[model samples]
Target chain A: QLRKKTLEALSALSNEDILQKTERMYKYLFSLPEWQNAGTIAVTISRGLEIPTRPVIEQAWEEGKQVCIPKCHPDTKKMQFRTYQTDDQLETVYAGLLEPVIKTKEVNPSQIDLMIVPGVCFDVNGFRVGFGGGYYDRYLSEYEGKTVSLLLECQLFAHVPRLPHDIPVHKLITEDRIISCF
Target chain B: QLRKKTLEALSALSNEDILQKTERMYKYLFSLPEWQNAGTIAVTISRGLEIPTRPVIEQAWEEGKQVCIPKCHPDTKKMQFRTYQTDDQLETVYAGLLEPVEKTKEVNPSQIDLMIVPGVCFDVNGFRVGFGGGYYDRYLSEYEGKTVSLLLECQLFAHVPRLPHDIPVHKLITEDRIISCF
Candidate 1:
């Protein structure tokens, strides 16, 4: 019933319109404490100075849960983890996201219990649309671990949209509902 | 010689000890003008709240380029962009990191000309010691665009210890050098 209603709402809009609405809905649901603090968590910030999420992250921090964010690489897709703390010196990178100031510390990804994912679009069927880079897709498929997505409801499609290479979200949280796809 | 000297200094330290040292290095590096300017351009931040980058991102946001930050999703290992001006709206997560408030606007990865990647450990050979979840390794191996790592000069290893799935960097920017491996 909910899926049918969502499909109808999605059908009512153009692809662009649907995209906009879905994104908004995604933001609403993703910001909820239940979504951000759902499990032992890890997350990544934006690229190229783009700003997508901020309010929710601050909330999570205020709530005090485990959160892990990503660091970038040039040649390969490997990443390192940093333990986030209030007192660590911070540096802005790319577009000014807060990072651990790149202190040469080592934190293991396996230590994380939950990971917060970012992307361009999402679907009820668990399809994810990224910023034309296959970084997350490759990570999701290869890691064989479970991760969740914070997507707008409008980005959610009844069927996963096919891109050159796409990955599926194990779970999705939107303003309206929490979905476990795949 | 640089690699050997650094590695020799690090050799006796356990991973945890090395991690602490690395974190210290990055934290200090974050305060540098070069890194601050670089971060001013990209705008990095955490997820959950409505604090965007741009103003308060770099310690010296007024004198530097524009700042931006990433907002994370709940289901995937990706980040959307946002801007922040101050730490006012920033919140702490369970991990004890500060993230920006949600800005409601997201950017495409293609729009990201540069990124400040995170990781657990990195080899001097440009290999990253990730948390074993494959979030970043997945992105680096898969993403279609060019990205970079902002690391401490001390974090550079002679030959990074690699796992079967580790990914390398395209370029590494430390307090002292910029290495383009790609």
Candidate 2:
């Protein structure tokens, strides 16, 4: 119910509003001490109506920080981030999402200083509803890096229904506020 | 299933084994840096077939540390730690569990230097399948204190199924070793 409700809210927003909110959130994100001190960042390729991650990736490149994107393994059923610099390193996978097409060097979770976690629905504590892959949850279970989420006001919720094992981001970023939620 | 499975295993243990294992854990727990540096400690009164917390509490008193026990408020569905030292400060509530009786000042969440969290089943990551009350999970949500759990070898599972909102302890003390979890 929360997933559908949040998706409906997100889909209802106009492109201009989404862009403006994403831009503002990006501003707050770039100014964070975690972001400034991070040398390697792990983020996902945004798909569909979700907040676009291209701007974040572009800024990371302009700042000369290594951008790491997740790549999944069918056998192990685990995800790992690989160095991604350009679109040529990506391959369009199932559901038109992107993955690394080439075998670039994999970045260990220890080497990542910051992770821009993706989520659809969130609460004040940073617990979120992902796209049902469960890959990020499995990865975040062992990750020790600083984690943050970027959200618009529409995507934030009063309470997100959670089970006992869900991992929350360390912090959350919205257009108007930066929530420190460890 | 993990909850019931862990309980049956706990109940099946011999009284002698339980005491011996608990003693070993206490030995390691006493030598830890976190335990040594903490001036205030928060823990629960153990119930049922769970690991005993009396030794830990008594040791804290001997070491001149302020011992804090949880006091639950059903109206707000929240919990707080109150200073507890003697039987005069306790009263038996439902299910035969004990809580502080007198209004002997409350302990602020910030004042807790270390928290001894309770759980049934746990993983090396410190993720735990708690008893159904969820008092600890809710309280641990915002607690900034260092957290640790005491477990027998039977309570330590390789992979405990978890939900999105579960909180993990910072460390796990077993009869043989101390596992540092992220």
Top model by lDDT, which number? 2
RMSD of model 1 against the true structure: 17.0
- Evaluated on CA atoms against the true complex, candidate 1 attains a DockQ of 0.03
Question: What residue runs in model 1 are displaced by over 4 Å at the alpha carbon?
Answer: A1-40, A47-51, A87-102, A163-167, B1-182
TM-score of each: 0.39, 0.47
DockQ of each: 0.03, 0.01
lDDT of 1 by residue, B61-174 (tens): 545544555554423555455554544323221112222333645445555444556543456567865433345666565555555565555556666667676567665655
The DockQ-based CAPRI class assigned to model 1 is incorrect
Q: What TM-score does the A-chain of candidate 2 achieve?
A: 0.89
Angstrom error at residue A177, model 2: 0.9
Taking all chains together, the TM-score of candidate 1 against the true structure is 0.39
What shift in Å separates residue A95 of candidate 1 from its native position after superposition?
7.5
**Lowest lDDT 10-mer window, candidate 2 chain A?**
A90-99
Model 2 C-alpha lDDT per residue in residues A14-115, reported as the tens digit of each score: 868888888899999999899988899998766555667888887888898988888654323378788876553232221121223435587898999999
Q: State the lDDT of candidate 2 residue by residue for B98-173, as single tens digits.
A: 1134345688999999899888778988998765456677788888779999888888888887778777899899
- Candidate 2: TM-score, chain B only: 0.89
